[PDB]
Amino acid sequence: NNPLFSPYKMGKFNLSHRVVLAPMTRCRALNNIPQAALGEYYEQRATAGGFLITEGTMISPTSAGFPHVPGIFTKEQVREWKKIVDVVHAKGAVIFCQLWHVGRASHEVYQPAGAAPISSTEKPISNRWRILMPDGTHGIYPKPRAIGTYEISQVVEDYRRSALNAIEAGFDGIEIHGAHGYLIDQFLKDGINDRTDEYGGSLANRCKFITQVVQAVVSAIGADRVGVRVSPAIDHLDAMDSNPLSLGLAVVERLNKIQLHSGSKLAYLHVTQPRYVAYGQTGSEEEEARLMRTLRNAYQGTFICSGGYTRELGIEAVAQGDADLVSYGRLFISNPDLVMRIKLNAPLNKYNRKTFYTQDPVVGYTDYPFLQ
Ligand SMILES: Cc1cc2nc3c(=O)[nH]c(=O)nc-3n(C[C@H](O)[C@H](O)[C@H](O)COP(=O)(O)O)c2cc1C
Ligand SMILES: CCOC(=O)/C(=N\O)C(=O)CC
> What atom of ligand 1 comes closest to residue 328's alpha carbon?
27
Q: Which helix (H) or strand (E) holds 118?
A: strand 118-119
Task: Spell out a b/e string for 328-346, using b for 16 or more CB atoms within 10 Å of the CB, else e.
Answer: bbbbbbbbbbbbebbbeee
Residue nearest to atom 26 of ligand 1 (CA): 308
Q: What is the three-class DSSP state of 39? A: helix
Query: In the chain, which residues are followed by a C-to-N distance beyond 2.5 Å, i.e. a gap?
Result: 282
Count how many residues are written for the chain.
Answer: 372
Name the catalytic one among 8, 182, 268, 357: 182
Pairing type for strands 13-15 and 8-10 reads antiparallel
Reply yes or no on whether 268 is catalytic: no
What is the Cα–Cα distance from 276 to 99, expressed in whole angstroms? 21
What is the Cα–Cα distance from 4 to 21, expressed in whole angstroms? 13
What is the Cα–Cα distance from 75 to 84, expressed in whole angstroms? 15
Give me the phi and psi of 146, to 5 degrees please. Answer: -80, 120
Query: Which resolution in angstroms does this entry have?
Result: 1.6
98 is in an annotated binding site: yes
Pairing type for strands 94-99 and 173-177 reads parallel
Sequence letter at residue 194: D
Which of 72, 124, 64, 120 has the alpha carbon at shortest distance from 98? 72
Is the Cβ–Cβ distance between 207 and 254 less than 8 Å?
yes
Please give the DSSP secondary-structure letter assigned to residue 114: G
What is the Cα–Cα distance from 101 to 195, expressed in whole angstroms? 19
Which of 201, 209, 192 has the alpha carbon at shortest distance from 148? 209
Task: Spell out a b/e string for 275-285, using b for 16 or more CB atoms within 10 Å of the CB, else e.
Answer: bbeeeeeeeee
| Structure determination method | X-ray
Sorted by where each begins, the domain ranges of the chain are 1-372
As for ligand 2, residues whose beta carbon falls within 6 Å of it are: 25, 179-180, 236, 276-278
- CB proximity list for 74: less than 8 A, separation 6 or greater: none
Is the Cβ–Cβ distance between 262 and 223 less than 8 Å?
yes
| Beta strand residue intervals within 138-294, DSSP E | 138-139, 145-146, 173-177, 226-230, 268-272
Cβ–ligand 1 distance for 328 under 6 Å, the answer yes
What is the Cα–Cα distance from 198 to 202, expressed in whole angstroms? 9
Q: How many CB atoms lie within 10 A of CB 354?
A: 9
- With the most atoms of ligand 1 within 8 angstroms of its CB, the residue from 20, 21, 25 to mutate is 25
Following DSSP, what letter does each residue of 135-164 receive, concatenated? TS-EEPPPPPEEP-HHHHHHHHHHHHHHHH
> What atom of ligand 1 comes closest to residue 331's alpha carbon?
27
What is the Cα–Cα distance from 163 to 266, expressed in whole angstroms? 14
What is the Cα–Cα distance from 302 to 269, expressed in whole angstroms? 6
The bound ligand whose nearest atom lies closest to the alpha carbon of 52 is 1
Residue nearest to atom 3 of ligand 2 (CA): 180
191 is in an annotated binding site: no
Give me the phi and psi of 127, to 5 degrees please. Answer: -75, 0
Is the Cβ–Cβ distance between 278 and 235 less than 8 Å?
no
What is the Cα–Cα distance from 22 to 36, expressed in whole angstroms? 20
Residue nearest to atom 6 of ligand 2 (CA): 180
Question: 114: buried, middle or exposed (CB in 10 Å: 19+, 13-18, 0-12)?
Answer: exposed
What is the Cα–Cα distance from 158 to 59, expressed in whole angstroms? 6
> What atom of ligand 1 comes closest to residue 330's alpha carbon?
25
Is the Cβ–Cβ distance between 282 and 308 less than 8 Å?
yes
